[PDB]
Design a protein around this ligand. Structure first.
Ligand SMILES: CCCCCCCC/C=C\CCCCCCCC(=O)O[C@@H](COC(=O)CCCCCCCCCCCCCCC)COP(=O)([O-])OCC[N+](C)(C)C
Ligand SMILES: Clc1ccc([C@H]2C[C@@H]3CC[C@H]2N3)cn1
Ligand SMILES: [Ca+2]
Ligand SMILES: [Ca+2]
Ligand SMILES: [Ca+2]
Ligand SMILES: [Ca+2]
Ligand SMILES: [Ca+2]
Lengths: 394, 394, 394, 394, 394
């Protein structure tokens, strides 16, 4: 009875085109906020953030009021899209192909005329995703909301703090906060300033996954390249080991290239460490070629330089703690015996060149091991969030 | 005649905005349930569950009633979307881009005014998919349903057990059950509690596919790395075999990385076993390098330590059950003969170093075989659902 | 004149909510069928069939009738969606995200009131796609159609044979038939049985493509592994050939894993043959390691067992059709000459071990060739549709 | 004034359900054509063509006419969707998920009642894409248009030649023409023939891209396999070169398999040439194994057949232009000297076997080079459009 | 009061079909522009540009005017889609599947009747993306806007300069400008010219990303192939190094093939440099085979040509700065000693052939290094935007 009577009366002469103020010269205060249920997807490559959000819009509708004693039991009424005036608040920085992704629900109105409009939606929004420190990165994705076609003279947009009471944690992203800011900007279209309310979703990436799936595997696989320095030259597999490990590491940059936007704004930290590793492994192959030249050095070819004999076999080697008819028969056997002496003399020259190769391996083992260690630590610890990350995620 | 007359009468003064209760002060009981036809897709990476569901909503509409003796043969009437009041029940944790994925169908109303609304739909819902025990994992995906804009004072949502009579099994997922729970929660928007009905779809993954396509192939491919310990050093292919098998195993983690969400909440069991295998294969390469140093040990280089001569050639080897002018001609032939004696003396030193290499291979074969076996069993059997899985799926 | 007059008269008091029967107590016969234009996509991984279909619905509308002599030249009238009653027939097992994929077109009505409604659409439907015999598989995808909200008491759904006169063949799938079946089932929602009409699209896969792109390439690539048995051990490339071929075959299972659903219902035949091939190639590597141990056997190491000397060098080898100062100088030259005799004695031992390696290669060549042949034939011919496929597709 | 007056008058008693003919017994002539702006995507795998098209529909509306002297300045009026009758022309062979992809725009009507309806749209259409001659292929994609629910008795569909004045060339596809054909077919639904207008978009693929990205790279990479015949056996890298090149060529068929539909209707020319190349490279590996058996032939093993000594070392080799105490000391030195003579005798046998290996390499180099050349030319020149393609694209 | 009164009066007799001019014979001036917020995605493969744009349409509506002194405080009114006439301006070269991607918002009208319509949208547009100079490319994507169904006689479309005040930079693309051009073209449909306003979005690609991820990695990986010339032949890994590096470089063209459209209009610069690199690396393998023939040259085989002895061992080598019973015993030892002399004579021949191999390596090292350098510089510097790019991006 009363519900039926109220609805009929409330729509009488109601025009949803009309901004529901008793005084047209005054603006309409609209309180705006949102509830952040969950961060669904942070697309780095396309620079889009996906969130499950419940917008929260409240205002007073001067015409939607009644005395509850004349309609007992009817404390609230509901109105669907198009039958009541509502604010045209949109996400400016939407990435959604239909632009407005909100699911229109009922506006809930109480007898004093206070309206509650809480449309849910899956929102896609453009977010400059800074990849400089990936995987130890923190993002600040803006969500700018404002009335599209009412400026500050007609619609006084006001902010209320975001609700995260129902926030469900992501797994990849720790929510740091969703602070909000209400600004009043002018646009080149119009002479009226249009207020907006922007919420900044601050997110720390949780680093365990990429620590285990990219960083640590690259460390361990690249160190396998350093075993080339311990592998004997006579194995005939130094180059196969080195070049095979090097080209396998390309998978990691391919994986990174599948996550990262193709931008020139910064060079991601992960890329810097992967580039350093492949350069170090590539130089290990370069050094390996030198070691093989020494190992295989032709004994009749050019003699070992004095510098080589001292810088490698003396100094570096010490530091590393390495260190009638009888006459004819006589001349024939002399030849055979002297022939062996030359062979053995050439053997000793070869041995020194092979010893030089071993010493070069040993110095390069220590040098590439130490150089691998410092470049890795230095690159990873240059991230401001590294210490926080290691403490929180590991 | 009568159908035409009834429809005309039933819409007379009917307002679909009105909650159809004879007494406005009382809430409207709405019975909610669903029928689960099939689980279409469990997207682990995006944490979304896709289901084919028929929602089941029933309530009484006080105004949609008639006396069947005055409209003979008209036992039921149907009303499409927008012409009758219906509950605004939505899936809260929807992942769908249009949020509400239900296909609006007719509400079926009988002469007593009992309404049946059974909209089908393909529903996408956010589901925390726990990957800790993958592939031996069990998921519990919630489907939370509630009236969006009517709270408990106006709409008394009540639960009925889910219907699985038409459930078509998936192939990848065994349905354990779809129990339901009706809660009464308060929200930071409002002072009215909003009832909800949540159904939890419990699903056991069937493990045969990933058992055959990931786990078993990795076991068999990694064991091929253990053949390096049986391969003779003189083959000159120990490193090629080991490093080639190791880098091939990366395909499996790449496959896993194509299924798993990039989260830091847990480390999947499959990842733990794959990580253990590659570490074991990687260490086999490391050991292989040592075996080659022994095999190729320079005989003039450092003598074999007493520890090496005993720990390998004595103890471990036993356990493994291995074990004028004539004077000038004389001095020339003496040199040639003594030269051979030194060569043979150096040969025996080489042989001992090569024997040491063989013993190290043999110990490492037994050690890496046993270590491969226990790590594999221990990791796989740490899954609570392993014994159930093996019994049910294999 | 007459068209304008008829349309006006026909809509007078017409209520599209009304089921158009002259007698409300009787059900309305609705003839249902479809025309199958083409099979667009059979998605095995997602278990969805995509078809281009023209539904065919016919019924009589008691109110949409006129005497053609009073409206000369107006033999038919058309009505778009929402202005005439039509059956609410839906595809139950739809996979489409909007569930109902039909494109609403006009209902064509003639002066006797017979209605023709032939909406086209691209339909997505859930189909249990049995992969047990892939690529020699035959599918039976059901398309279940029924009135969503009218049961058998109100709507007498009747079947007519599917039209394939306009069927355009697919290229991958031979259409076997689209038989139809009309059932009368009860549901747990309701006490009225709801009739349905299900058409079963039977499809034979054409096997040439996967025969040429998966099966035959795997046969030919795997046979290249058998050349290891003909490759001499001294080449030092036996392991590189075997392991390289083995790991290349993984591409094929990766390709298969990109087509197959991740289900545990069956193990596809293609997977069984690929698994057999890799196991055979993997065992060839295992045998290759043994052959290298024989080839490289240390002559001073353990003597050849009597079993080895007979089972390989005698029986299997036959079957394969293989088969003062002068005294000092004397003792010095004696040593040199006796030294050569021991070297030659050890050479003969080595030769026997190398001959044993060659015989093992030869037996394994014949054994792995024969074993490859039978496993391949046996697996492929275990498919019931193999003989049909080879005759029809090759 | 006049625009406002005309619109009011024109809608008075207008029924958009009515086919706008002054005489209902006559059919309505509808002129149909289209403008082809651009070919957006030719999806070979899914057999769908995507085009940007402006449909062109014209007809006369008997009711939408006025005298321009009574409405001065109003020479035309526009009507949006649903307010005027228009033809229900659809694309029969649509691949679009919503089936009808046209963007409804205004119908432009002039004072004589001539209507112009030119809706744009992005159209997806099913096209049998014949892959037999890919990349030198020419396609003929049909676009069949017709009134869905008006047959020839009511709607006289007439064709006008397609407009390509605004055609923007594709880059991958040369447009040959878009001829049109008007047919009159009967359907199994109805007794009225339904006219249709089909346009056939003929397209020649431009071959430069696939010439440079698939064909030529495969030629050059496969020829690298032929260097195995020039590589000395003693390098110990013949098998690594051959098998490594062979397995790298699989990338190309993988790329092709990512473009081609999985159909059994034909075998693409590109596939035939790739299959020929891998078979030739695979046989080169097979021959390489034989060459290594000769190179490594055991000298004590079976003697070289007379056929081998003549067919290789004589004929083929010529064609290729290759070609007391002193007695004891005596017997001891005799042994040492005779021992060397046997070694040298065995050396000469080895040399002949190694020479045989070199000759086999040389014949196979010339044979595989010539065989590679003819198979490549013969396969590529079997395409009817090859000569056209090479002239136009290269 | 006044807002309610104004809205009622303004809609009285208003017909949104009517073009709002006081004089129908005159055209309606519509000012068109846009605001470019951000370039979202430049899809090279599909030739589609995605932009976030706010269209700006302004015109005067003769009927939507009032005297503000009679409606105090009501300075503006808003009207949603379908209740007011607006221009039907569309993007002609749209790539969007629904063609018109604009999100319809309110038209803002002030008391003088000036209308502001600023619909936002995510626009997809076809853009010929010229890949000739990629990654150093500059694109000019047209955005053609015009009234679909009003020609110049009725609608006088006028341009205003694009607004980039809110432009957010992309990261991959530097915005050069968005100049606009208003044209007046005739179409084959009609006799009225249809004005249009086209904006050309000029974009320079920022090259750092592809410089670091494609160009530089290819340079550094390919140079590793040049180490084959420094690797000794006796290593037995020259071919493994060369062919392994060569086939790894295929990844880069695969990456490029994943970005580039499959067009034959041009050959991208990146492809030209990648093709040059692989040809150079491939020729290095070809040369490596020659070096191995020299290294392994049979000493008894054909003597070294005079040309070889001079062009390599003399000229090129200099430039590179390389450089009773006793009689029987006598004849036996003579044989042994003469046997060694022949061995040593053959050794010297071998050494010269090995020296020739070393010289060929050295010339080829210098030749391939220099040839790699010039081809790389020459190809990269042939891009007109190279110098700009290096200065701006590096
Ligand atoms: C399945 C096949 C399973 C196994 C194949 C490999 C093992 C069998 C061959 C052993 C070699 C051998 O002859 O002898 C060794 C025994 O060797 C062992 O002790 C075996 C230990 C098994 C480890 C398996 C690793 C590879 C499995 C990869 C499989 C993956 C295949 C599928 C991949 C997809 C050493 O001893 P001996 O030489 O006998 O000693 C002689 C002297 N004596 C008198 C003192 C005793
Ligand atoms: Cl009709 C109209 C007037 C103004 C506007 C604009 C002003 C601010 C900035 C974009 C949008 N909101 C949008 N529509
Ligand atoms: Ca992320
Ligand atoms: Ca799953
Ligand atoms: Ca298929
Ligand atoms: Ca194409
Ligand atoms: Ca781009």
């Amino acid at each position: 009875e009363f519900q039926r009577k109220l609805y009929k009366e409330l729509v009488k002469n109601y025009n949803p085109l009309e901004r529901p103020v008793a005084n047209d010269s005054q603006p309409l205060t609209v309180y705006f906020s949102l509830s952040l249920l969950q961060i669904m997807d942070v697309d780095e490559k396309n620079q889009v953030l996906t969130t499950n959000i419940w917008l929260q819009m409240s205002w007073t509708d001067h015409y939607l009021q009644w005395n509850v004693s004349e309609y007992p039991g009817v404390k609230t009424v509901r109105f669907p899209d198009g039958q009541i005036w509502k604010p045209d608040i949109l996400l400016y920085n939407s990435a959604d192909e239909r632009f407005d992704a909100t699911f229109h629900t009922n506006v809930l109105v109480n007898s004093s005329g206070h309206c509650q409009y809480l449309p849910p939606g899956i929102f896609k929004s453009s977010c400059y995703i800074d990849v400089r420190w990936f995987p130890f990165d923190v993002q600040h994705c803006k969500l700018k909301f404002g009335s599209w076609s009412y400026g500050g003279w007609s619609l006084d947009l006001q902010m209320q703090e975001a609700d995260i009471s129902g926030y469900i944690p992501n797994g990849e992203w720790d929510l740091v906060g969703i602070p909000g800011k209400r600004s009043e900007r002018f646009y080149e279209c119009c002479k009226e300033p249009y207020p907006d309310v922007t919420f900044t979703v601050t997110m720390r990436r949780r680093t365990l996954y990429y620590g285990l799936n990219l960083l640590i595997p690259c460390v361990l696989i690249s160190a396998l390249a350093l075993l080339v320095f311990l592998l004997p030259a006579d194995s005939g597999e130094k180059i196969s080991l080195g070049i095979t490990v090097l080209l396998s590491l390309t998978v990691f940059m391919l994986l990174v290239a599948e996550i990262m936007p193709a931008t020139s704004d910064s060079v991601p930290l992960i890329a810097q460490y992967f580039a350093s590793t492949m350069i170090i492994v590539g130089l290990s192959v370069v050094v390996t070629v030198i070691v093989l030249q020494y190992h295989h050095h032709d004994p009749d070819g050019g003699k070992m330089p004095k510098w080589t004999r001292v810088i490698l076999l003396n100094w570096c080697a010490w530091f590393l703690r390495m260190k009638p008819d009888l006459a004819k028969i006589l001349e024939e056997v002399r030849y055979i015996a002297n022939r062996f002496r030359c062979q053995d003399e050439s053997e000793a020259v070869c041995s020194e060149w092979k010893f030089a190769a071993c010493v070069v391996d040993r110095l390069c083992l220590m040098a590439f091991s130490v150089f691998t260690i410092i470049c890795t630590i230095g690159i990873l610890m240059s991230a401001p969030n590294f210490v926080e990350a290691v403490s929180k995620d590991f």
